[PDB]
Symmetry: C3
Subunit: 29 residues, 3 copies
Amino acid sequence: EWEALEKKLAALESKXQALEKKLEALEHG
Amino acid sequence: EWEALEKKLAALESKXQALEKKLEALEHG
Amino acid sequence: EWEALEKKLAALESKXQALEKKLEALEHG
Ligand SMILES: [Cl-]
Ligand SMILES: [Zn+2]
Ligand SMILES: [Zn+2]
Ligand SMILES: [Zn+2]
Ligand SMILES: [Zn+2]
């Protein structure tokens, strides 16, 4: 249970950072 | 408390995916 | 530590709200 949550959490953090860069690129272009 | 962490993670995973869907629709649309 | 997970989830939720806010301002720009 713990491991399943932490792994899902790390993946969501990586996605979060990627979407922040994507939104900035969308605004900036 | 653990159930609340699971529920928060699931709701944020869905929020995360919904935002990704709009960003991908707009950047290739 | 469960507080470490709580903190990471809170930071992701704040990032999620910040990106949604900026995307909404962009789309309505
Ligand atoms: Cl706590
Ligand atoms: Zn794309
Ligand atoms: Zn709107
Ligand atoms: Zn829209
Ligand atoms: Zn409007």
